[PDB]
Symmetry: T
């Protein structure tokens, strides 16, 4: 039945190898498994996608319009730079939860700005991969 | 195992104050939800709400070494109080910052949080469910 | 018909503190002038001054639904307190901001007011007569 | 025989027709009548002028030097843009009360700044046309 | 049917003589003729005014309230400076198209801010005097819809 | 004679479905049809491309260098963010008209900045899809002169 | 023969009466006399105009195009606010010297900005009325 | 001859809080040091620490006309309270500002002090010895 | 057998044709040949890639992790806008030399900022295509 | 009566350095012109040019009480040196600041002058004639 | 045991320059005060004042490894010289920054110090007594 | 054919000062490396290091018209000296800016260079090898 769009942006494929002091030793496979297990608890399915390509994420949002209950998004660095990604989230009309493994507000000033936070129903930061589980919980209860 | 639940100024008005922004749940609903989630991990909650910054700072000092972590919604003090950030550091409690609303979608002066500099995680816009996720983070860090 | 009159920190020192800026009138004079003006309109005033922000916040909360409006001189909190603006909003009282001095003629840090965002009216530099006009605004809104 | 200069800047001739949700349904004729009635209570006269030309207000201020007890001015949009009008108020040496029908601090950021507030003895905003009655009362008592 | 208010602000009277490398060699009379001819294609008339005096522009906006279908405005330097002129456009209640002969966003930073852009339904910049023809076309079609 | 490059950036494929209170109920196909019909009035043709992929827009600009008389571009959100897209317009050497359906200067502050505006000969904003028709008219007349 | 356009903007008519601590006790008549005497030394004439009206100054610049050797301008407060005045100076094509009786850079921050300095051949500030004499000297030698 | 010694929020935690920044000395140590320096000049010290800004403001109001001066470590209120500045001005007390750490070597939000606008002197980074220097300044004024 | 990743970002395929007054008449093929010849002098190989797609450079950086001695990157306009590319360089763990044909600091202000300079071991600007020869020399000696 | 003429760094290159900006006159031409003008008022000039800030500061200290004023073109030190402003204040010389070019028409970093805070007058863009006007100001202040 | 005492540009004019701000004490007074405080702790003071930044930099370079610390009043260089900061770092000397006035109560351009980033301690507004406190800080380090 | 090699303040301390940032090479090593590289191209180097800005300025002036170019590491003057940029411009030498460290990776005050506005090339973070590349740029421009 209900489907959640799980979108991971640039560099998320490198989770577990990239800056482990900041992002931890968990993998993207762990993220998808955790979100899928949480959704299954609520009778929902997860359609997951990761890409270093902003255009692929936008295409995914457009394609999910009208057919998914919501979106869990970790835009990566696009969080602080893409108005196009924000416009895509708005075009999707999907209730969207923004997730960050790290706490961007405890990092460089350029990470303190998120175009997505303008459209997101909720923002979860610094909870590690557990943020994805909470994000699924939010969407399952909005629905 | 004990979690300190701290709600700052105006949170006693939850359910009455600006319901289009903060919703129709109450501070009692917040405390009962954090309590129910803490019980799933075999923990208890010590809850305090105050309109007085000094009472929150005294509560953080008093919890040092005796609590496993702090769930804090500093309210307006989020954006203004260095003294509260120094109190969180002095407590040495792992701290999750919660906001009912999404401050990044509101006025520019709400985009700045002193507490986000020290918090292990920040949850915004999830309504009262944010407090449930914050207990989950603290129970799993301690674990 | 009751007007909440709130004076913030340091206003107890009116007549002694910086008399070249604030003049020689006292807080007693302020309360008496506001009381006499309210009486002309069949109204009473409940007055409170405090060096504690939490006491002002508690007063706004306690006056919700029972008072016709608030006259507030926030003192130095004018420039610093988001929590006090949130309390004015939680109170749902039509609020007149009063400053004895003209803050726009003083240091740059006094040019910004959180309360001015939510106030129905702002009166500055009329001395203690500003409290008389503030009562007249609230009595006529009530009419 | 004591005389007050009442100045209304650009667009105030449209009072009652322009943006009634912001400025109300009263007219410029109502404003002048209200100021005149208040002045008469104190044995004072009001010389009123409105113009869509900044130069006309400056001329009026110069011509009033030494012959008027004070000035009540609503500069309109000139409030946020004219250093020339500020210099004129100072050249006049007239005690000046700045009046705004609306509360500019509750509006767009460009309206939060006033050159005239730097020289005004008092600033009244958001009291509707009653602000002009309070302004006359201030001048009659300074005198 | 109906009348469009065409307003040109300070210095536009100097069109063809002032900084021709930036503003071109056409005159203000060419602008008015072009706007009038475009309006005529839609059975509309144009009341044109230019002034170095901001108050005259404000008076023209006040006087046009309720009797014109819209306003085409090139505020000149007042674009970047006048809150009073924005308040006058709001008081007019006229649907307004802002026109610039040059492309202000390709010029000095102080030209990158427009008060009028906050109220205008459309902004046309850098089309030379042809921007006034497009502005009449927008107002003719808003009115028709 | 000649061909105009019409480029639409990210999200424009969603025209008619995305935020219709801001962008209207016309489709991207209506935009292309309108531009093509205007071009035909001048004996010109239009090569139209839309993509959510910035690289595709850059490739289209590179490929159009020397063979097209000009470019009409609605960069979408890339307007506010992409230096790479400005560098591509410069590399194209095409006279460029920037078009926005909405009036970005009446929206959020982050929409008030355009890299493309630094290179465009003209900028048209808030005319709905009619801005693309005016943009073809500008390019048809620059080419004629 | 050669003619210099001397333009004095808003408030300059008040020279000698306005803020004498800042602007001195000399009059506008003194300014015109001094400039006229200096020009006469070089076989030149001065066409002087003062107005509180920006439109009058712009009209004067347009009218002087092609018939004057240059312009001496004290724009008053328009110095820090008018792009229209700058555009007019450029349209005039007149070599222009900007003159300030006071030193604006030793005053409020808003006086530190001049649109005219962008077009002026020279800027003279703080020399009192003597600045006008120097300005005539510059234009007589450019010519 | 009496000096008002005011310590702001969190200073009660001196010795336990962020010892790599504030050291291992305690508030008791600060009060003893200031009291001994004051006694060398025949002066006494009325000391108060509070996490409650209103209490510090009341203390300043009550010391008006009775004290030779004030030594103040406002804590985080240093960067946030106009009210505390207004209180210092209302006190009319010559005031020395003291910081155990050097705020200018820390986060930008700590580079701003409202009290520094009114203080006769500002001492930073000298640890608890700053309080001894501050007493010396008020004694020689 | 030691391998250097040579990355050229958007528009660099147009080298020799685009803005020749700024970037010169040399081509991308010249750049790759120059880097390759320099690498061969040190017994090293160069794997070169250019793309108008940010995602392709990110993919290339990820794929090169652990298998290359370093990276020479000219990000093009991505230099001033992509946090994702910076995160990618860090994920790669490759010593990276940033190269600009032009001197961006001598150009528009928006070109004065580089995200890549935050992670690069070295930055070479304005040496034309010789910058790529110097970059290879840096990597060959760090190695 | 003696005037101190101080020229800062690079002014020895006048006539060679950036002639499109500074013209074709020399530092010798500057000194001879100031000398000729000082002689019309019965004064002498002591001229020093140095590329060393310390030598200018020593010259200001040494002129204290013995000179009637200072004509200074600080060169690049205009925009950067607080030490030079403190030296001008320590000298107690009435000081006229001269610039050959118009800094307000150049790069933003040239729009700031520490010396303009202390100077009685500032002359910019008049070429070497500025020095002549500066001597005239000093001769008439002393008079 | 030797302390390097460095005074920057204009400090030679102490007593004559802006006496309403800097007081009537002289540079000779500052050096004597610091020297006497140093002698109380069995230490000596090598003092230098200069209007030439290069001389101050050379002094810091030459004191590397030979001095217990540095007391510095950089004058206007405080708000302008990265070179002087680089010199302090090159010296490796524990450094106390001293200001006779309180720069935070003055013009905004005086609110910024490059030296405050490297200094162990900053003392402002105590007049020439700041130098005595600075010697005390280095002696107890 | 002669290259002016200028090293600014503190560079005499290379190898002792902050070795974790600048490394263990000495100023002698810098001069010897630059000298050997120049010799390969039939060129010589005239080297100067000073803790005095005026000495560097004098050197640039003295090298005008006789040297083929300048290699400059301005030290802390990079971030602070307008007078040094004006000297580079007065010299008319094609100039390469060299930094041993990568200033973009360090404190914000080190991110700004006056010399970078005028330099033909900027090389940062290559250690002392940056001086070798700088000589190679100047020799090939000369070719
Ligand atoms: O790519 C990432 C990861 C991130 O989104 C996170 O999950 O923490 C935070 C971003 O700032 C960063 O660019
Ligand atoms: O008091 C509150 C409530 C809040 O903390 C929240 O929960 O959303 C957000 C704050 O900005 C505000 O001042
Ligand atoms: O405490 C006060 C009094 C005040 O609010 C007034 O009444 O003028 C002005 C405030 O700036 C100041 O901090
Ligand atoms: O013209 C007006 C009217 C106004 O002064 C008022 O009365 O509220 C407020 C101004 O911001 C505006 O430009
Ligand atoms: O006066 C004008 C003309 C203008 O409005 C235009 O038409 O291009 C642009 C304005 O910036 C300038 O001040
Ligand atoms: O994508 C779009 C559409 C737009 O370019 C327009 O056509 O109005 C305006 C942009 O700000 C926005 O990001
Ligand atoms: O009106 C004046 C006079 C003035 O131009 C002068 O002559 O000093 C300076 C201006 O700042 C001021 O607004
Ligand atoms: O509370 C404190 C302690 C402090 O005042 C000090 O003593 O160093 C410094 C402040 O920045 C901080 O908030
Ligand atoms: O694409 C490029 C080329 C460039 O990186 C260079 O090589 O100089 C400089 C960048 O600013 C520009 O966007
Ligand atoms: O050195 C100079 C010359 C100068 O002072 C002038 O005379 O125009 C202007 C300064 O900005 C520049 O640094
Ligand atoms: O030269 C000095 C003296 C000073 O350092 C002091 O001692 O107070 C303060 C500095 O701001 C000023 O430039
Ligand atoms: O003195 C130096 C050395 C330096 O120029 C370098 O070589 O890296 C970098 C500068 O920031 C610093 O002040």
């Amino acid at each position: 039945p209900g489907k959640i769009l799980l979108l991971n942006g640039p560099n998320l494929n490198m989770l577990g190898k990239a800056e482990p002091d900041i992002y931890g030793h968990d993998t993207l496979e762990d993220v998808v498994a955790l979100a899928t297990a949480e959704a299954a608890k609520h009778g929902l399915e997860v359609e997951a996608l990761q890409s270093n390509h902003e255009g692929e994420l936008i295409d995914a949002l457009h394609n999910a319009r009208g057919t998914h209950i919501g979106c869990v998004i970790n835009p990566g660095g696009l969080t602080h730079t893409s108005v196009a990604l924000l416009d895509a989230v708005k075009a999707s009309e999907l209730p969207t939860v923004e997730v960050h493994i790290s706490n961007p507000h405890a990092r460089e000033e350029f990470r303190h700005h998120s175009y997505i936070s303008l459209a997101a129903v909720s923002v979860i930061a610094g909870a590690g991969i557990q943020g994805y589980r909470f994000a699924v919980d939010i969407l399952a209860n909005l629905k």
